Design a protein around this nucleic acid. Structure first.
Ligand SMILES: COc1cc2c(cc1Cc1cccc(Cl)c1F)c(=O)c(C(=O)O)cn2[C@H](CO)C(C)C
Ligand SMILES: COc1cc2c(cc1Cc1cccc(Cl)c1F)c(=O)c(C(=O)O)cn2[C@H](CO)C(C)C
Ligand SMILES: [Mn+2]
Ligand SMILES: [Mn+2]
Ligand SMILES: [Mn+2]
Ligand SMILES: [Mn+2]
Ligand SMILES: [Mn+2]
Ligand SMILES: [Mn+2]
Ligand SMILES: [N+]
Ligand SMILES: [N+]
Ligand SMILES: [Zn+2]
Ligand SMILES: [Zn+2]
Lengths: 365, 163, 365, 163
DNA sequence: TACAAAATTCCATGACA
DNA sequence: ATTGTCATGGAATTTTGTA
DNA sequence: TACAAAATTCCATGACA
DNA sequence: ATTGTCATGGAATTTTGTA
């Protein structure tokens, strides 16, 4: 319909005159620098674009290059991009090319016992019938308790923590969302004692970073102490715990133990600087030291980061994707931006999920 | 001399026998001499062995310069003696029958005793589970001197469970 | 011995006078800004340093901070660093903090059939009794052949390649060192036909990068074609092969098929630009196109890269490290630097290994 | 008209029956009309089915615009007819008994026949394994016109196995 | 001898277990 | 002997159709 | 108002499956 | 609701002992 006028030589908004628009085989054709191409009617173009794209589900440029072989029309790419936006398959399989924005460096907990980070390591080679270590890191000081367990289970966690909290009770316990800690029994145990449970976003160990980073040290020391010997870790845990609690962080210039106690115990090479102050003068120096510790700033954003905007279309990573299946869930909507690195989404569907950017891609197009 | 500080001396003693809770009969009592902080360890015997296992737990946290104790067979043994030389802990013994400690420690070691009987009658075979509560309770009690809790003297900060 | 003169007040090379060097408890002591420290005799210092280090096998700064508590002497760190160099355990467990230098971008093969890259994908969900796909990528053009197999085995490889090389015989076949290709049977098959086998360095897929990158596309297309359906890949391989061989690389502006043939087949959207040239004029245009393709340059080095120097002490990564065991082999010597990214080492011990930087750390100290 | 190019026409025919090698009896022969490049596919029958399976292999590489063939039952069938319409291949049939091809193709299709008998006598039940060698051989033979090998016309480059 | 916008090129990001 | 690669989609740049 | 070298601080790199 | 962390050992910087 709209193609008659063009052969007539009358101008059409978007069809550059100066190119001769002739007719052959009952199709409208144009002679262009690139060659001679067919101009299809509006009502055919979407069908065309889809056909080309469906050959190997190619993105913008790759799709267009195919189409360009035979056809021309105004703003070809505009139409291509429209299709790629509606291809269910590509949207849920294609990877990202936009990276998460800069991480955050959550303020260090004010006082010890404000916050405990916990996680299980393992399974390890059976020593004495045990397979796992429960690791508990005090957020403020970095002080760490270790407990050997036969399963990464609520039972074991509760048993171990009943010992630990004979010393003091924490305000908050941070954990990942592993079955051990997401169980109702644990919540109840925690409620009985006035402890808030706080959970990492799903599938994101960075959130448990304080405890995770400590797992590395724990493993690395056990490893060194076990070179040449059989892997008999059970008897070493106490030694490791003690060793690591009395190790300086070159950055802080303190051992976790010093930050917890303000004075060394009777260990090798025990610092004696405060030997002359009364416990009181010592206790305030520590209070002062605790507040003036190093605190890391958040790194610069990479060239091509993305940040979450309320009402954005966003896709969550498939947790345990099967072989040959899409690595992403269908699209969801950002409901609240909790911080620039955590959001609430209306997922599949529709439930509220608190989720990390690192487990999200912005739906392209 | 130098002013008294936590970990300078750990006073230790056995309490028991008690009615069996979870097949446990005795409590080993560790009180820090300076702060009055208390640890409680359930044992099956007032033996060197049961002591060593218990104190291995405590000494993954902090090691004292001195342990003081009465001349109980469990503490005078040579196995305990060796254990202490290994960890570089000096052993100090009160003369027999004249069992002296710090003023503050007697006063502390006494509450523990009161507090045990208190929540032991009518709750007799259940005391193993309440040790954590008993422990927390003591460590957060205000000694009229120095108007600080053992918890506060040890950590230099308030508790999230006050009394 | 050497400590008498100091108390006497006579100068010792390396002991800064102005600090009073007194005596207490039968040890020599010095009063320093940091506090009052003990100065131990030469014959004790190594024992001290080792004792401190052995507490948690701490590195330079962390070790020194312990020692500094009780002792002082000239150039403490010098002595610390000496120990850390001789600690078997730390050397083979500690990770690197120096990154490999810039990758290389090996010249694209001149003509097709110069070089084939091959690898197996899988296992995949059993389709038609098959589990693996043999993938064969022509180095020059990127053209890819796909073959379904029941095992990643020499038998299957040989069978498949007997079909492929009915078309043409390649000069070189590049593969990883998987049992399938390192077998003598394969070498023999290859020798019978005058094909050079060339192997990637051990445990380094970057070397097979051309074929590996192609595996990604293969998997990603199968995936999209399988959304909603059961994973019946066997019947799709031909379609996938065809699809991908006729897909433009937005960078090259050509499909593998175009680069192999200089003219499209009878496929959807087949380019018609050369329709007017005789096959001959067409064949030279292609020869010209093949030589003038994009070629990626090697990226800038990161701040803290390291490069291999003949006779350097160097450590190879443990292949399949057990739980709690060291992640590195003992030290070895660089024998030849093949390119700035590949070396020959005298390993464990002593055999000649051709090895990648990425699987090496420079022995610190 | 436009100058003749590879993939414009694929001439196909059956050779056989032959003595059984690996339980195979026939060879399907595909020659490209312009270059003279040859594909050989062993089949168990001169049937539409055996053809389709074979040509599915070949058409993962390249698809011709036209397939030309004699009026063998295997090619005239409607199943083959549909197969070809699917892939957008036009079907062209030589009149019965007057089976014409390109000049170059007859000459090619003839060597194949000579070459088969040649390495078929004395090697009779072993010919399945030699197809690859036979194939390579043909594709790298110099047709006196245009003094190029089929391999060279198709790929625009020399071979790593010349003859 | 210059404009807005389309068309092209750039290119970090991530995945080949 | 041996060696990373390249589709993707926003952004940055270049070219285009019209003065 | 200054030098070489030791001592300290900086900080990219990698590992917590 | 929730959020990355920090030992390590060369290099870059600052301080030190002596003029
Ligand atoms: C890094 O972990 C990998 C190990 C891989 C592969 C891939 C990856 C991830 C990766 C994949 C592809 C390309 C790149 Cl450059 C890349 F980084 C293989 O693809 C592969 C094969 O047999 O093909 C064998 N391995 C083995 C594992 O047991 C070893 C070589 C570690
Ligand atoms: C990225 O792969 C990982 C997955 C991890 C963990 C660790 C890593 C690697 C990693 C480890 C530690 C810290 C950081 Cl910062 C980090 F990046 C855990 O440590 C963990 C747990 O239960 O503790 C559970 N996962 C599960 C896996 O099934 C999911 C959270 C994917
Ligand atoms: Mn966990
Ligand atoms: Mn973990
Ligand atoms: Mn007693
Ligand atoms: Mn492989
Ligand atoms: Mn692979
Ligand atoms: Mn016939
Ligand atoms: N925070
Ligand atoms: N190269
Ligand atoms: Zn698609
Ligand atoms: Zn070490």
């Amino acid at each position: 319909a709209e193609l008659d006028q063009l052969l007539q030589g009358h101008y059409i908004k978007g069809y550059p005159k100066q190119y001769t628009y002739f007719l052959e085989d009952g199709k409208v054709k144009v002679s262009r620098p690139e060659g001679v191409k067919i101009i299809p009617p509006q009502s055919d173009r979407q069908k065309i674009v889809l056909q080309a794209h469906n050959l190997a589900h190619t993105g913008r440029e790759a799709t267009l290059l195919k189409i360009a072989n035979l056809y021309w029309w105004p703003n070809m790419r505009k139409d291509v991009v429209k299709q790629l936006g509606r291809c269910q398959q590509c949207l849920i399989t294609n990877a990202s090319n936009k990276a998460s924005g800069p991480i955050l460096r959550p303020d260090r907990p004010q006082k010890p016992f404000d916050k405990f980070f916990i996680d299980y390591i393992g399974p390890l080679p059976p020593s004495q019938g045990y397979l796992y270590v429960l690791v508990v890191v005090d957020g403020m000081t970095g002080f760490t308790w270790l407990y050997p367990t036969k399963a990464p289970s609520t039972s074991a966690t509760v048993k171990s923590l009943n010992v630990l909290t004979s010393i003091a009770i924490p305000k908050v316990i941070h954990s990942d969302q592993g079955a051990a800690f997401t169980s109702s029994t644990f919540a109840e145990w925690a409620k009985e004692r006035g402890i808030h449970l706080e959970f990492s976003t799903p599938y994101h160990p960075q959130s448990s970073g304080k405890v995770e980073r400590k797992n590395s040290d724990i493993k690395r020391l056990l490893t060194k102490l076990l070179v040449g010997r059989p892997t008999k870790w059970y008897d070493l845990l106490p030694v490791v715990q003690l060793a690591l609690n009395n190790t300086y962080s070159p950055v802080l210039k303190y051992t976790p133990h010093q930050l917890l106690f303000g004075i060394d115990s009777n260990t090798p090479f025990a610092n004696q600087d405060t030997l002359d102050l009364t416990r009181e003068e010592e206790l305030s120096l520590l209070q002062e030291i605790r507040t003036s510790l190093y605190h890391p700033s958040t790194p610069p954003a990479s060239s091509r980061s993305w940040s979450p905007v309320v009402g954005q279309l966003v896709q969550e990573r498939v947790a345990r994707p099967a072989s040959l299946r899409p690595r992403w869930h269908k699209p969801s909507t950002v409901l609240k931006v909790l911080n620039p690195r955590t959001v609430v989404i209306l997922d599949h569907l529709g439930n509220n999920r608190t989720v990390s950017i690192d487990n999200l891609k912005p739906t392209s197009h | 001399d130098r002013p008294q500080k936590p970990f300078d001396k750990f006073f230790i003693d056995y309490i028991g026998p008690l009615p069996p809770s979870q097949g446990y009969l005795y409590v080993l009592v560790v009180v820090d001499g300076m702060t009055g902080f208390t640890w409680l360890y359930p044992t099956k015997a007032p033996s060197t062995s049961a002591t060593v296992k218990s104190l291995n737990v405590l000494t993954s946290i902090a090691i004292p310069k001195v342990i003081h104790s009465d001349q109980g067979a469990a503490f005078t043994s040579s196995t305990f003696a060796e254990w202490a030389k290994e960890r570089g802990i000096h052993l100090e013994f009160s003369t027999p029958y004249h069992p002296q400690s710090s003023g503050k420690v007697e006063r502390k070691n006494s509450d523990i005793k009161r507090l045990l009987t208190k929540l032991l009658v009518g709750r007799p075979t259940k005391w193993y589970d309440l040790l954590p509560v008993v422990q927390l309770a003591l460590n957060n009690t205000y000694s009229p001197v120095l108007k600080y809790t053992p918890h506060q003297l040890l950590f230099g900060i308030d508790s999230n469970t006050p009394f």
